[PDB]
DNA sequence: CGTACGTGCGTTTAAGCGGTGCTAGAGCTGTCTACGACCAATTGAGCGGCCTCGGCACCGGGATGCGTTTTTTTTTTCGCAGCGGTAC
């Protein structure tokens, strides 16, 4: 019943959920692994901080 | 005006070739596992309205430093007449 947001499970502020959707609806591939969005929201957050 | 390329002829090298010998590693087949797509339902994260108050652009009014001229000086750099010692 209690739904923790994946972004929390990675300790990322970047939305690992919205990254997963954007990828599947991006037409990048047929199938997205479940680590991929994590890995990507991570890298995104990181470069966001590096500039900020 | 100075010099560092360019040509070319002469030595040094090692690339290229064709063939031979050994073996990693490419790249396929079959099997089976784990992982991810799909669905449904349930949520709260995230978005479009409101309503401040404070960070920012502004403004005018001196203050610091930066460039221009042009005035006064310091240092160097010839040139003319006015010396002190030779010479006799
Ligand atoms: Cl993955
Ligand atoms: K091979
Ligand atoms: K597998």
From Swiss-Prot:
N6-(2-hydroxyisobutyryl)lysine, modified sites: 25
Q: Which residues form the signal peptide?
A: none
The protein's location, in the record's own words, is:
Nucleus; Chromosome
Cite the post-translational modification comment. It is involved in the initiation of both imprinted and random X inactivation. Ubiquitinated H2A is enriched in inactive X chromosome chromatin. Ubiquitination of H2A functions downstream of methylation of 'Lys-27' of histone H3 (H3K27me). H2AK119Ub by RNF2/RING2 can also be induced by ultraviolet and may be involved in DNA repair.
Cross-link (Glycyl lysine isopeptide (Lys-Gly) (interchain with G-Cter in ubiquitin)), chain numbering:
2, 4
Where in this protein does the record say N6-(beta-hydroxybutyryl)lysine is found? 2, 25
Residues annotated with N6-crotonyllysine modification? 25
Assembly and interaction partners: The nucleosome is a histone octamer containing two molecules each of H2A, H2B, H3 and H4 assembled in one H3-H4 heterotetramer and two H2A-H2B heterodimers. The octamer wraps approximately 147 bp of DNA.
Instruction: Tell me which family the UniProt entry assigns to this protein.
Output: Belongs to the histone H2A family.
Q: What's its job?
A: Core component of nucleosome. Nucleosomes wrap and compact DNA into chromatin, limiting DNA accessibility to the cellular machineries which require DNA as a template. Histones thereby play a central role in transcription regulation, DNA repair, DNA replication and chromosomal stability. DNA accessibility is regulated via a complex set of post-translational modifications of histones, also called histone code, and nucleosome remodeling.
This one is known as Histone H2A type 1-B/E
Q: Which organism is it from?
A: Homo sapiens (Human)
Q: Coverage of the whole protein, first to last residue?
A: 13 to 64 of 130
């Amino acid at each position: 019943a209690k739904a923790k947001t994946r972004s929390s499970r990675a300790g990322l502020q970047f939305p690992v959920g919205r990254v997963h959707r954007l990828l599947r609806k991006g037409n990048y591939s047929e199938r997205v692994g479940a680590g991929a969005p994590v890995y990507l929201a991570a890298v995104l957050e990181y470069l966001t901080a590096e500039i900020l």
